[PDB]
Design an enzyme around this catalytic site. Structure first.
Site, PDB file in Angstrom:
ATOM      1  N   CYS A   1       0.859  -1.184   0.006  1.00 12.65           N
ATOM      2  CA  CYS A   1      -0.170   0.157  -0.068  1.00 12.65           C
ATOM      3  C   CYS A   1       0.823   1.353  -0.127  1.00 12.65           C
ATOM      4  O   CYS A   1       0.193   2.456   0.089  1.00 12.65           O
ATOM      5  CB  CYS A   1      -0.706  -0.112   1.249  1.00 12.65           C
ATOM      6  SG  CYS A   1      -1.650  -1.470   1.775  1.00 12.65           S
TER       7      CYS A   1
ATOM      8  N   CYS B   1      24.198  -3.473 -19.495  1.00 11.54           N
ATOM      9  CA  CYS B   1      23.085  -3.694 -18.806  1.00 11.54           C
ATOM     10  C   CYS B   1      23.353  -4.674 -17.448  1.00 11.54           C
ATOM     11  O   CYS B   1      24.266  -5.677 -17.545  1.00 11.54           O
ATOM     12  CB  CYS B   1      22.034  -4.615 -19.496  1.00 11.54           C
ATOM     13  SG  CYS B   1      21.492  -3.750 -21.300  1.00 11.54           S
TER      14      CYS B   1
ATOM     15  N   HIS C   1      22.537  -7.568  -9.747  1.00  7.53           N
ATOM     16  CA  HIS C   1      21.742  -6.827  -9.211  1.00  7.53           C
ATOM     17  C   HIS C   1      20.482  -7.757  -8.579  1.00  7.53           C
ATOM     18  O   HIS C   1      19.671  -8.117  -9.153  1.00  7.53           O
ATOM     19  CB  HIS C   1      20.909  -5.784 -10.201  1.00  7.53           C
ATOM     20  CG  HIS C   1      19.831  -5.056  -9.647  1.00  7.53           C
ATOM     21  ND1 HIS C   1      19.607  -4.660  -8.388  1.00  7.53           N
ATOM     22  CD2 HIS C   1      18.980  -4.362 -10.233  1.00  7.53           C
ATOM     23  CE1 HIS C   1      18.883  -3.803  -8.124  1.00  7.53           C
ATOM     24  NE2 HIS C   1      18.128  -3.666  -9.318  1.00  7.53           N
TER      25      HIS C   1
END
Length: 382
Positions: free
Chosen positions: A82, A198, A329
């Site tokens: 939320c 990348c 990552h």
């Protein structure tokens, strides 16, 4: 209420499936490392903030109990439904807000028509990106070239420099120096972006122990205490059609505002920063982030790059770790690994990556929401 990082730890970041341990063991290695670095008992941790993207709501608790043993401490999952934060940011809030004296920030990840093509690419080449992201960063990079005359080679040089730094980071998935030509000739991902520009997926974990001033003084931990002198998060800035741009769509102004507010709070400027760890998910993000951070004026990243002002012997040593491009990552763990490197740098413990005389460090990181967090560090008690 001043906030200090008093210990740091991470696992090596490795290719998914190269190391056969599950996420709780990854978390345990990072966390126990940070706790040993801190020099405190496990019982001193009053709350834990745990960042991870994949898996159900119990994984954070399972990682913490496997790492520290059973306890009744709060275990806060950074990525809720939320709100759309980071483990370090939340940790720092807890200390700064007086809600705890000592906390563990823990992060981990273990992997479990153009959009469809990018999805397949991301899967086959092992990229740590969502399908839209190569296209959005490619769009942003093109806009920069078209508006300012930046060359496709500039983006490749950014990636090249990261891979070169990576040779001295044993925590990095990739530790090999590629030639500039090899970066340029690697497999096309989208537009000018090639594979070596990348970030790949890595699996791993990171951790930091955060503490109040009174905690540091009472326990005599002044020596390794790295102060967070400023930290700012900026969520999406709502703009008009006429002012929108590809660069803004990938968070350029969120970075810019976050950094400006940090600089003002700490009373410093970009030229005081000695060492940077930033979120180089693509070389294109790193390149525009040089301007967003105010290291150089608008459109001048190309010059900064050509002067080698992003590496050893230049003005700023950027991503001494090798960046996300080399490290890979693991979504939950990346921020804490940046923090680890910057703390080691400021503590003069970065060994073959050491930036001599580094006193002011800057972190740039993105939360699961897309929110940008910029953090400034200095030794707490020099």
């Amino acid at each position: 209420n001043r906030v200090f990082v008093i210990g740091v730890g991470m696992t090596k970041f490795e290719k998914p499936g190269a190391r056969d341990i599950d996420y709780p063991d990854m978390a345990k290695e990072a966390g126990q490392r940070a706790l040993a670095d801190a020099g405190i008992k496990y019982s001193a941790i009053q709350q834990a903030c745990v960042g991870y993207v994949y898996g159900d709501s119990t994984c954070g608790q399972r990682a913490i109990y496997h790492s520290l043993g059973l306890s009744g401490i709060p275990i806060i999952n950074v990525n809720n439904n939320c709100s759309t934060s980071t483990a370090l940011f939340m940790g720092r809030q807890l200390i700064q807000g007086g809600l705890a004296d000592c906390v563990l920030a823990l992060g981990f990840e273990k992997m479990e028509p153009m959009d469809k093509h990018m999805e397949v690419m991301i899967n086959r080449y092992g990229l740590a990106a969502v399908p839209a992201a190569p296209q959005m960063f490619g769009n942003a990079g093109r806009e920069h070239m078209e508006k300012y005359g930046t060359k496709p080679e500039h983006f490749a040089k950014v990636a090249w420099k990261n891979h070169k730094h990576s040779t001295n980071n044993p925590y990095s998935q990739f530790q090999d120096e590629y030639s500039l030509e090899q970066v340029i000739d690697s497999r096309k991902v989208f537009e000018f972006l090639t594979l070596l520009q990348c970030c790949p997926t890595s699996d791993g974990a990171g951790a930091a122990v955060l503490a109040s001033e009174s905690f540091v003084r009472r326990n005599g931990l002044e020596k390794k205490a790295v102060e967070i002198v400023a930290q700012e998060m900026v969520t999406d800035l709502s703009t008009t059609f006429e002012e929108n741009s590809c660069m803004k769509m990938v968070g350029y102004d969120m970075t810019r505002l976050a950094a400006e507010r940090c600089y003002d709070t700490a009373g410093v400027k970009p030229s005081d920063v000695d060492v940077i760890e930033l979120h180089d998910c693509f070389s294109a993000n790193e390149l525009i982030t040089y301007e967003a951070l105010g290291l150089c004026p608008e459109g001048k990243a190309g010059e900064l790059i050509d002067r080698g002002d992003n590496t050893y012997g230049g003005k700023w040593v950027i991503n001494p770790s090798g960046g996300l491009i080399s490290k890979g990552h693991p979504l939950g763990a990346t921020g804490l690994a940046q923090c680890a490197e910057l703390c080691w740098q400021l503590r003069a413990e970065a060994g073959p990556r050491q930036v001599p005389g580094a006193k002011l460090a800057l972190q740039h990181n993105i939360g699961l929401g897309g929110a940008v967090v910029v953090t400034l560090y200095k030794m707490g008690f020099p």
